[PDB]
Amino acid sequence: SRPQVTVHSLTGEATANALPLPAVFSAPIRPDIVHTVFTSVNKNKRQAYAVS
Amino acid sequence: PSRFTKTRKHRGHVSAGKGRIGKHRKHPGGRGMAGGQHHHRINMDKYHPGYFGKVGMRYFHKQQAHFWKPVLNLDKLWTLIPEDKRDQYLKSASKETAPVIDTLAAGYGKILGKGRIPNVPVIVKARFVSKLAEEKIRAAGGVVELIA
Amino acid sequence: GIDHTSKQHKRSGHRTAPKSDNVYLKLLVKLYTFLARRTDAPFNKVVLKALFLSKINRPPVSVSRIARALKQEGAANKTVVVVGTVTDDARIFEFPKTTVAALRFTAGARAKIVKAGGECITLDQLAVRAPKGQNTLILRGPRNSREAVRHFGMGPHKGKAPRILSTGRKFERARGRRRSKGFKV
Amino acid sequence: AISKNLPILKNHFRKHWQERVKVHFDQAGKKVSRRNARATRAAKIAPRP
Amino acid sequence: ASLPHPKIVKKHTKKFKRHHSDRYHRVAENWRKQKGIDSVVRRRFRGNISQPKIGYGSNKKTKFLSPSGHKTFLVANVKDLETLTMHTKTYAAEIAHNISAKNRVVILARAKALGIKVTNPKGRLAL
Amino acid sequence: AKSKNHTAHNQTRKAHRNGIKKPKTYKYPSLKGVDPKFRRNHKHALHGTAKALAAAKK
Amino acid sequence: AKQSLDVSSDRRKARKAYFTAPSSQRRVLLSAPLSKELRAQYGIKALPIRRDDEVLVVRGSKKGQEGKISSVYRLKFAVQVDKVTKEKVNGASVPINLHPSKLVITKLHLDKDRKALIQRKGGKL
Amino acid sequence: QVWGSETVASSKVGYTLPSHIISTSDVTRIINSSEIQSAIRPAGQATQKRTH
RNA sequence: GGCGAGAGACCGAUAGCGAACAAGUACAGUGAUGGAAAGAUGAAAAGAACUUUGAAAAGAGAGUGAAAAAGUACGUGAAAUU
RNA sequence: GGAUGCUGGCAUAAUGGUUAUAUGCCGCCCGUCUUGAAACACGGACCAAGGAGUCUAACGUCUAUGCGAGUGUUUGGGUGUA
RNA sequence: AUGAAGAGCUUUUAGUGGGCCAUUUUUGGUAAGCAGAACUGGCGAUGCGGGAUGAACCGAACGUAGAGUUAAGGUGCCGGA
RNA sequence: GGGUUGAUAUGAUGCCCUGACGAGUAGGCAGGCGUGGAGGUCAGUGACGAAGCCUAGACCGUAAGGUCGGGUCGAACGGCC
What we know:
This is part of a larger assembly, with eight protein chains of seven kinds. By secondary structure, chain D is mainly alpha-helical.
């Protein structure tokens, strides 16, 4: 009983073709986890700075 | 990190949480495990007893592949069988179709009796077993057959 | 002045409003504290505290443990409640049909229960079915099964598991541990 | 030094290890160069596996 | 134009000055606690400066208020001001210091039109 | 460079800060030190008693 | 955006490249556009510049002003133009440095080489 | 096809989408549903009367 | 290390290589060796014509400049001290 | 189960604040080791700028998070907007 | 009997490990503002009023203000009475 | 220690009621102020003057500190998570 999703065209307005929701959007929504994981995964692109 | 830190909260306070009398100096008790038969002896006898001395027999050139003998108890002994056929066998707990288990191919070397498998026959292949494990198996109606 | 017979401005020593920043857990806490405040129910208050509890004061509960509980008398058609997580245990082969309510369910345990014909339930569904703890049964898991509780309280003549990385011969099986090398503890 | 209940530790840093440290910052570029080499070798022995 | 507030008591109008802020130029008035061991200021001897503490704190009903009875709120633009539209009787506007004179003129006309108070309505006026 | 050698000063204060709690007392205390003869026979007796009560309320 | 590896995105390197650029690279940097007339008449957007081109200034306080080149001071990254001068209180005159990014051309000074360059860049003459 | 759903598998090995511990987020709807309200006692006026 | 390329949650002229400059320089020491300080006018020198006081330096005017509260003792120009 | 009513004057530097000074009373120089510092115990002529519990390996308790009798993608490979 | 201001339980970690004073008991010593112990309270780690002055004495222990009453100490004047 | 999801309106870590308490070196814990740089947002301020500097001029906060006005100057800079 996924509600539906209407598709739009490239020319704008809309179409009759429609879809379900893939049930990943029914997943929980945790900004604490997003925050931790983001801190680390954004740490992971880093070059080494250092002194002589 | 560095901003959730009691250093940052000590700033302004004089001794940085180390004291005025006691004076955080370098190595006042020694370095490392120094003084275990001396001024650190209480600690070594109260928290880490057995530290001083030798006990047994030296084994030159020891190999933890001669000593590879992982254990499996009868408690599990179906974890090795998938869930796809488990209930099939367990309800057709019968003869002439008995499930065969290669503990060795699974990663085990010995079989033990931690308890109470069902009353279904099984065929178990293994290098070693315990007396009690096997008694339980063949009481269930199964058997052991050894391998290398 | 005052000659105090106590300590002043001391905290209760009891956790309110956990420091888990999990918003769904906080929703559950809002719910169950409403219910504790109004439904005059010790079960609601118990659940509220157990929701405040930490990871290790929230151990897991094995379905085999649940099965022992349902093997009690008068407790078969009851509703089990676990504030924590429920783990599978393939050391058993049968299982009854009951319903279980809890925060988390290992996929294996969920499968086991569903296969036995029950339903795995959240605490909000529980709050709509049995607000005052109608026909429930709370379970808590072991706490002293922990490999830090081995070392807790380490001294002579306690039998209490030193803190040690490597095991075997010549790692603390000597002086202090036998009467040949001086003394046994 | 020896103090409260804490396991005995064996941390072998009594030498100039900070003259001898290797830090594989090149995990990635070294993977990439391995790949380029595989590709060039294959193009050199083109039909071969 | 403000709201009924009680009478405002501050409990210390005089500024807490660092000890020897007057004696040595290297010691600035930014308050700073004597953590010493023989400091008569830390010991609260009579005739020394009064150290801050939470009893000097203000009444919640009058806290953050200006003499007008308004709370100050900084604006850089008509948008930040339109946010204050419906709270004129409690909140007043401070045009920021980095604003240009023409934008100040705009903001002032808009605040007049909307009935909003402005506590720096003379920045960068010539005449 | 001498010193103070011993003193009992302040120790009562510390004790009674976190102090003189009676250890505690339980039902069914320990049998450590008791005559092993008595222990042995008590074991056999409790076994018999449990057997009997179980068969009774069976 | 950048998609190669032999291309620098660093202010430091580009700046020291520009400043230690030698006189040939400086020619190519001192290139200047053409007016609408010459752009349509030759088929080209812009071009290097030299000592006897005719030119029009369209940015600055000497906006709007025409003349002929008198010197190309590549060391200073500039162009010194007759009829565009400053009158010094000692009754004197000085040429005023400009930039060929702001200049625009009205009339060239042609040769075998400029003509070949145009035919290279795809012009019609 | 990639994050999965209730009925198909995700194509990420050993991965099942994370599970909700609460059936929804409208705790107010829960509170006001019917049965809570049946078992609930009545309430005070949200601002106790200053006595003495 | 050498040669050539690219980058950075790095330092930003008491920092970062000792060295952003005519730095392994001036300079010291018999010698081995030691080893600095020092960046910024302004968009552009347009870097102050001319008059006057003065032995001159400079000053006062003038004038350039958007600005001399930018005058090579030059971006701003804190404090101590005056 | 917490003060309202009546009236007057001013509506401004009058109240009030800031500040300097005067007056009354109090007020020893800070930092430090010290049982004890105003000390006839030490450091401090003054100002600026710099300036001291960091990083790592392996660990203990504790707390969060994920999975859960399993857990750990990231030696490596595949792939890539690299 | 009185009180209970909640009772029990665990983990972990800092600083400390130079001490000094008074009452009373007390040891050596001619004695000491000496040395060494005991119980309690204090200073250290603590300002306030009083003791002219003082680490410890007496009184009293401290959020910011107001009003009232006192403590110890005092009431010729300095200095409130 | 309690009360309060109830609908319309704002903040549930919120609001509100009641009672008690507030000394402090070493030391611990907590909540915060501020600096350099990073990801994000304010379609943020800005040559009609950014930052910086001066200001017994004003305002907020117990305070760290923050804001504003006037002057100087000339090219970049802040609020919040």
